Amino acid sequence: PLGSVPEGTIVSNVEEKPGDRGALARASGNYVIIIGHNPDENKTRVRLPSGAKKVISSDARGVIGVIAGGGRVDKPLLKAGRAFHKYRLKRNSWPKTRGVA
Amino acid sequence: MRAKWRKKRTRRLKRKRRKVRARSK
Amino acid sequence: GRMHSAGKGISSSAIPYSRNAPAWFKLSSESVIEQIVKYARKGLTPSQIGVLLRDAHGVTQARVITGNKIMRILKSNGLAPEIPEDLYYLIKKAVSVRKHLERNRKDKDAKFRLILIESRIHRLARYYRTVAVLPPNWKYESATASALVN
Amino acid sequence: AKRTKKVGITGKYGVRYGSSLRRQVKKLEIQQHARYDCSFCGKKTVKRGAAGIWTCSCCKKTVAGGAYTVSTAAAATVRSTIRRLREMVEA
Amino acid sequence: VLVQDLLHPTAASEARKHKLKTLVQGPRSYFLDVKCPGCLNITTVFSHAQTAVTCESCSTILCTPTGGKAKLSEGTSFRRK
Amino acid sequence: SQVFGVARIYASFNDTFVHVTDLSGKETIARVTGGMKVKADRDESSPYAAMLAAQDVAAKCKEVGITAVHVKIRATGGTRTKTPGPGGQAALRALARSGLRIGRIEDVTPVPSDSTRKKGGRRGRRL
Amino acid sequence: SINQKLALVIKSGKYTLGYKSTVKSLRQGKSKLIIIAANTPVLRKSELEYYAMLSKTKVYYFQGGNNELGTAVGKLFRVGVVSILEAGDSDILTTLA
Amino acid sequence: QGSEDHSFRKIKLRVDEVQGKNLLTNFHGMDFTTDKLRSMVRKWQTLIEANVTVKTSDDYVLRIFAIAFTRKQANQVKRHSYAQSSHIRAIRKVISEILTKEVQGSTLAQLTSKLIPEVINKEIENATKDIFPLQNIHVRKVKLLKQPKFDVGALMALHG
Amino acid sequence: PKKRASNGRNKKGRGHVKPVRCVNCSKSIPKDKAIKRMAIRNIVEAAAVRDLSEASVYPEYALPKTYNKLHYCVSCAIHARIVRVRSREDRKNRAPP
RNA sequence: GGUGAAAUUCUUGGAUUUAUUGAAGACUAACUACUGCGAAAGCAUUUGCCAAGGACGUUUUCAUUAAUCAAGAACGAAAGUUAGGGGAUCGAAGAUGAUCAGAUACCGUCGUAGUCUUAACCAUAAACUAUGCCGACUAGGGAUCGGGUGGUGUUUAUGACCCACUCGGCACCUUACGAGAAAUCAAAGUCUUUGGGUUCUGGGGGGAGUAUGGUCGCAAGGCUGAAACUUAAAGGAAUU
Ligand SMILES: [Zn+2]
Ligand SMILES: [Zn+2]
Ligand SMILES: [Zn+2]
């Protein structure tokens, strides 16, 4: 839990409400930074990977360290086919045609 | 002038002898 | 002129003037042939044997105790190596630093001297080929260095 | 002979796709196809399994690493930062 | 200074000279007798020594090498021989 | 016999702060600026406009119980430009008017073990 | 600096290399002062130092691993664990502790 | 104290618990004042710094320092008076033996009592005879890291 | 011409050291070049301390003095500090009196 | 806040000063100097590891192994470039308050790329000591770092300090009857009393590091690089 860590550590896969079984920092290679405690009023502050902050309670769970598999956005999809192979596993949201058409 | 800005004028015309003399076939 | 760094000093030796010397010593050469070959069962580092007797015994130079230098002494009784005395140490310095260069690899300052000292490896090699103390065309490359220096 | 001058792996693609869309790729898959130092034996027997899985052919150990390495750049600073933290509570 | 006698100098110049720049150059080191405090035999160790050579039976200490002169540092003597 | 406040003036350039506090720190008393007393904005560095600031600061503190004080001055401080100006020499005499009880007058201008380089460009703010 | 101290063990006396030849020796007491790497699998880091506690010999933990003990003995391949049989002229067996 | 010529060695005091309208502070550490250091600096001399982390009887893990300048000795002709610069990394480990070896040990009722009459500086007079005797050496800072928790028990030794 | 022997900056045989910046104009100058001076002042005015510090129990406590080291530059020194020129053959001393 | 004055901005949404603190990145002040290491650009917090380098001691060892280098190579501050990371401070582009007849110039507040690093890149700078390397001679002194020697020296066997030295460094001072057009110089001296080796470069200024190609670089750009035509001085030094 996030009261058994002291300040400055670098956690991920924590849960919003205690019992959620992991809801944030689940993606391929991110992290939530602890940005300040308070012993009383048992709600810790954090640092979310986009620009927002958040206050959650100390009974939230959480794994330590950044998620593996990250840093994959750097290579281009670079042809049509191995972009089509990517979406075919996930959902039908591709090709997205345009609105002036 | 100063020879720092005589050199700046004679370096940004080498992007004009290189450009418009090239496509002019 | 030091040829690689900008020193100018003279930190060297100065042999005495006398040839016949030193008018105190005991029995001459005929106990001192093998008295150095006795130690030379330890290898050995051949130019070092002049200085390990000297600080302990009166041996002062090879001109005094016998009438020969310690290449012509040591070779005749079947001891002297193939690559005898300095180029064995000079490529030993070459093979030592290239092991350091396969690790950290950012040393632009320290592989500078490996292009510098290997200009010394070739130079003493093709002196030794010119006088044919080492046979000519001398296959030398640092791939098989540790099988050559050992 | 020498096969190709500066194309390298991207002769696979050929004339298409542009320059910088092939330059930025080819630096990265030499960190993907090629082997590494398996730290549980020392020998060079680890290659890619999947998207971030780096198994070893001997030793049967799989390392969950980055997408094109076994330890990334952001992965380097966290492992130092953790044993920063283990000696404000232990030592 | 306009005149000297270079062949016949004084006596206080040679001590102010060096190993390597006298009229006819010679050494400053000198072979030297020490017998051990324990043993009786003399190994001719000289004070401008090297690696710490000692007597052959009881090699306790006879010389310690430094940046300059090695030293006796204990017990018996130095003759000068 | 006495009870000690901490005067601890801040006589930076283009301003002058002064406020007595408890030595606990987290119970301050009545800060007063160069803009409190007189208003022309030329008067941020006059002598007699700097003495009036400590004048209202002093007799307000005796109404609470601050009899003795610990003056411990501060200039601009840090990589901010380190030197005392027209306040610390001048307005400390405006604590002597009360006969108020002083001590320990040296500075707490913080000292950069050089870091996080200054402003004004490399070449400097030429006029 | 024990890396020079291991560099004269081999030229002065007898030894072994590899796992099986070390534990070939500990089962008749002829071994002394087995040397252990650091990235050996910790089963066999303990499976020999258990009986090394029973066969009276002392243990050393070389800080490097398999591919670091190879150059500190002179050979040019991996070596996990070095037993030395006799090092009769060497600065090792008394200089520990 | 009132013994005023200890006008150096500035002290912070940890105020911990209010003992029934008579709150009694606990120990925090030590500083100098911010100019006794600077009133010792001077050109044509050599400097030092050193530090360590160290435990105590409990685990008030703290990080002390030590500063020591260089004396103009007797019969000086030079103005410079600089030390060896290989002995600087021979003094800074022996002094970082004695500032260690008193601590790891040194309860905060006896590390405190050693630190007030500056007993420790007399040891450098007696054990840094090696390379240079010294001029003024002082400890200059102690600051904690790891007070374990509130510790209502052992605070009660400090009272009237 | 070479209007001074060490024309710039008291620097012979090293090339480059670091810059350290001026205080008032904040020009960047290398620290070997422009200006040394210590400026000790005091920290009190004309004190009249016998009744300034009769209030100060633990009497007068300090004779309080501060230290400041400065770094001017070449381009701003002669607009405060009184040299502003020197002649040809008098540029030779180093002690200030 | 801010300067000589004024404001944008931040303000009873509690700022600015304060106190307990954490973080995040860059930077190692004060010592720090006529002082060091490095081939040159450069290199200042602690310790460890790796291999390297100059100096000195030598009554070791080889016996001309050497100097300078066309071609061909390694390193090479800053700004740049490609793609990642962490993005505190400063801060070209930009917006804004003032000044200005005039400000997209100086000043004041914000501020993107950069700054730092990891893989790769161009190879330029006042990359200056405007003084190519090797060698040997020719004035006097005082300091200074490193090594060594010797002093019945001081401090308490050791270290530091003093003294007389010596060798190699960075320089300095006093003068030079020599050299230099002069400023200046222990080398710019041993040169019309005209010869110790060896590499490179320059011939009046502009046109012009331009054009044409060659050639390297992904790019900015680099190395090699003329001519037509034009004009009688541009320059160096010190005097009033
Ligand atoms: Zn494995
Ligand atoms: Zn012996
Ligand atoms: Zn300035």
What φ, ψ does residue H85 adopt, rounded to 5°?
75, -5
Nearest to F9 by CA among F25, F22, F20, F24: F20
HSE of A7, CA atoms in CB hemisphere, 13 A: 7
**C-alpha I49 to ligand 3 mean position (Å):** 36
Nearest to D54 by CA among D44, D43, D45, D62: D62
- Partner residues linked to A53 by β-bridges: A47
Nucleotide nearest the Cα atom of I31 (by C1'): J32
Q: How far is D82 from chain A (nearest CA, A)?
A: 7
- Record the tokens describing residue H131, joined without a space: 């390379």
Q: At which residue do the structure tokens 């009887």 appear? A: H57
> Using CA atoms, how far apart are residues I97 and I85, in angstroms rounded to an integer?
17
HSE of C87, CA atoms in CB hemisphere, 13 A: 22
**C-alpha I75 to ligand 3 mean position (Å):** 8
Buried b (16+ CB within 10 A) or exposed e, E11-23: eeeeeeeeeeeee
**C-alpha D84 to ligand 1 mean position (Å):** 28
- Give the residue whose CA sits closest to J162 at C1': H75
Cα-based distances in Å from C48 to A29, C17, F57, G82, H87: 62, 23, 86, 33, 33
Length of chain I: 97
> Using CA atoms, how far apart are residues H114 and H122, in angstroms rounded to an integer?
12
Nucleotide nearest the Cα atom of H84 (by C1'): J160
Mutation for testing the D interface, residue in H52, H53, H146 having most D CBs under 10 Å? H146
Q: Residue H127 CA to chain centroid, in angstroms?
A: 17
Identify whether the C-beta of residue H115 lies closer than 8 Å to the C-beta of residue H8.
Answer: no
Write the DSSP symbol of residue H130.
S
Write the DSSP symbol of residue G83.
E
Residues of chain A contacting D88 with CB distance shorter than 8 Å: 6
- Partner residues linked to G86 by β-bridges: G14
Any idea which ligand is nearest the CA of E43?
2
Cα-based distances in Å from C127 to C89, C123, C137, E33, H147: 16, 6, 12, 43, 72
- Subunit contact F124:I28, Cβ cutoff 8 A: yes
- Subunit contact E20:C54, Cβ cutoff 8 A: no
Give the CA-to-C1' distance from D6 to J120 in angstroms.
Answer: 13
Domain that holds residue F39: 1-127
Do C and E have ≥3 inter-chain CB pairs under 8 A? yes
Cα-based distances in Å from C67 to A38, C81, F65, G3, I7: 91, 22, 106, 42, 63
D85 in contact with H at a CB cutoff of 8 Å? no
Identify whether the C-beta of residue F53 lies closer than 8 Å to the C-beta of residue F91.
Answer: yes
Cα-based distances in Å from C30 to C75, F8, H84: 17, 94, 52
* Cα four-point dihedral sign C85, C88, C90, C92: negative
* Cα four-point dihedral sign D3, D6, D8, D11: negative
Rounded (10°) angle between helices C114-128 and C87-102: 150
Mutation for testing the D interface, residue in G19, G39, G68 having most D CBs under 10 Å? G39
- In E6-45, the residues whose Cβ lies within 8 Å of chain C are 19-20, 24-27, 31, 43-45
Which one-letter amino acid corresponds to residue H104?
A: Q
The three-state secondary structure class of C136 is coil
Nucleotide nearest the Cα atom of B13 (by C1'): J210
Residues of chain H contacting F107 with CB distance shorter than 8 Å: 34-35
Q: Which of residues 84-103 of C touch strand J (CB under 7 A)?
A: 85-86, 93, 96-97, 99-100, 103
Which one-letter amino acid corresponds to residue E68?
A: G
Q: How far is A7 from chain D (nearest CA, A)?
A: 9
Q: Which nucleotides of J are covered by protein (CB under 7 A)?
A: 1-3, 5-7, 16-20, 22-68, 73-76, 82-86, 88-92, 106-109, 118-119, 129-131, 134-135, 140, 143-150, 153-156, 158-163, 165-174, 182-185, 188, 208-212, 218, 220-221, 236-238
HSE of F27, CA atoms in CB hemisphere, 13 A: 7
Contacts of D52 (CB under 8 A, 6+ apart): A28, A68, A69, A70, A72, D64, D65, D66, D67
Which one-letter amino acid corresponds to residue D12?
A: K
> Using CA atoms, how far apart are residues E57 and C96, in angstroms rounded to an integer?
38
- Record the tokens describing residue I60, joined without a space: 């007068």
Identify whether the C-beta of residue C14 lies closer than 8 Å to the C-beta of residue E48.
Answer: no
Cα-based distances in Å from I26 to F26, F75, I18: 37, 19, 15
- Subunit contact D42:G67, Cβ cutoff 8 A: yes
Give the CA-to-C1' distance from A1 to J44 in angstroms.
Answer: 45
D58 in contact with G at a CB cutoff of 8 Å? no
Identify whether the C-beta of residue A35 lies closer than 8 Å to the C-beta of residue A46.
Answer: yes
Contacts of F125 (CB under 8 A, 6+ apart): I25, I26
- Subunit contact F104:I62, Cβ cutoff 8 A: yes
Identify whether the C-beta of residue I19 lies closer than 8 Å to the C-beta of residue I31.
Answer: yes
Identify whether the C-beta of residue C88 lies closer than 8 Å to the C-beta of residue C142.
Answer: no
The three-state secondary structure class of A6 is coil
**C-alpha C122 to ligand 3 mean position (Å):** 57
F105 in contact with I at a CB cutoff of 8 Å? yes
Give the CA-to-C1' distance from I28 to J95 in angstroms.
Answer: 28
Q: Give yes or no for CB of C56 within 7 Å of strand J.
A: no
Q: Give yes or no for CB of H130 within 7 Å of strand J.
A: yes
Q: What is the DSSP string of H52-73?
A: EEE--SS---EEEEEEE-----
Q: Give me the total of CB pairs closer than 8 Å, taking one residue from chain C and one from chain G.
A: 3
- Subunit contact F82:I68, Cβ cutoff 8 A: yes
Identify whether the C-beta of residue F117 lies closer than 8 Å to the C-beta of residue I75.
Answer: no
- Subunit contact I27:F123, Cβ cutoff 8 A: yes
Q: Residue D79 CA to chain centroid, in angstroms?
A: 17
Nucleotide nearest the Cα atom of C49 (by C1'): J60
**C-alpha F124 to ligand 3 mean position (Å):** 7
> Using CA atoms, how far apart are residues A45 and H102, in angstroms rounded to an integer?
41
- Subunit contact H33:F107, Cβ cutoff 8 A: no
I55 in contact with F at a CB cutoff of 8 Å? yes
- Record the tokens describing residue G84, joined without a space: 């030395």
Nearest to G33 by CA among G4, G11, G7, G62: G62
Q: Give yes or no for CB of I32 within 7 Å of strand J.
A: yes
Domain regions of chain I by residue span:
1-97
**C-alpha I70 to ligand 3 mean position (Å):** 10
The three-state secondary structure class of C77 is coil
Q: At which residue do the structure tokens 């002058």 appear? A: F16
Q: Give yes or no for CB of G3 within 7 Å of strand J.
A: yes
Cα-based distances in Å from D53 to D28, D32, D42, D49, D69: 16, 11, 18, 5, 9
E53 in contact with C at a CB cutoff of 8 Å? yes
Angle, vertex CA C24, rays to CA C23 and CA C25, nearest 5:
110
The three-state secondary structure class of A32 is strand
Q: Is I14 exposed, middle or buried (0-12, 13-18, 19+ CB in 10 A)?
A: exposed
The three-state secondary structure class of A53 is strand
Q: Which residue of chain D is at minimal alpha-carbon distance from G41?
A: D40
Identify whether the C-beta of residue F75 lies closer than 8 Å to the C-beta of residue F12.
Answer: yes
Q: Give yes or no for CB of A39 within 7 Å of strand J.
A: no
- Partner residues linked to G61 by β-bridges: G36
> Using CA atoms, how far apart are residues H39 and C79, in angstroms rounded to an integer?
71
Q: What counts of helices (H) and strands (E) characterise chain G?
A: 4, 4
- Subunit contact H33:F111, Cβ cutoff 8 A: no
Domain count, chain F: 1
* Cα four-point dihedral sign A42, A46, A48, A53: positive
- In G56-95, the residues whose Cβ lies within 8 Å of chain C are 71, 74, 76
> Using CA atoms, how far apart are residues I67 and F83, in angstroms rounded to an integer?
10
Q: At which residue do the structure tokens 């007898």 appear? A: G14
> Using CA atoms, how far apart are residues F52 and F49, in angstroms rounded to an integer?
6
Contacts of D48 (CB under 8 A, 6+ apart): D32, D33, D54
- Record the tokens describing residue I48, joined without a space: 């009249």
What φ, ψ does residue A48 adopt, rounded to 5°?
-85, 155
Where chain H is discontinuous (C–N > 2.5 Å), the residues before each break are none
Identify whether the C-beta of residue F57 lies closer than 8 Å to the C-beta of residue F76.
Answer: no
Q: Is C73 exposed, middle or buried (0-12, 13-18, 19+ CB in 10 A)?
A: buried
> Using CA atoms, how far apart are residues H67 and H141, in angstroms rounded to an integer?
10
Q: How far is F108 from chain H (nearest CA, A)?
A: 7
Identify whether the C-beta of residue C91 lies closer than 8 Å to the C-beta of residue C144.
Answer: no
Give the CA-to-C1' distance from F33 to J15 in angstroms.
Answer: 14
> Using CA atoms, how far apart are residues C143 and C145, in angstroms rounded to an integer?
6
> Using CA atoms, how far apart are residues D54 and D32, in angstroms rounded to an integer?
10
Q: Residue G91 CA to chain centroid, in angstroms?
A: 14
- Record the tokens describing residue F120, joined without a space: 């004004």
**C-alpha G75 to ligand 2 mean position (Å):** 38
**C-alpha D57 to ligand 1 mean position (Å):** 8
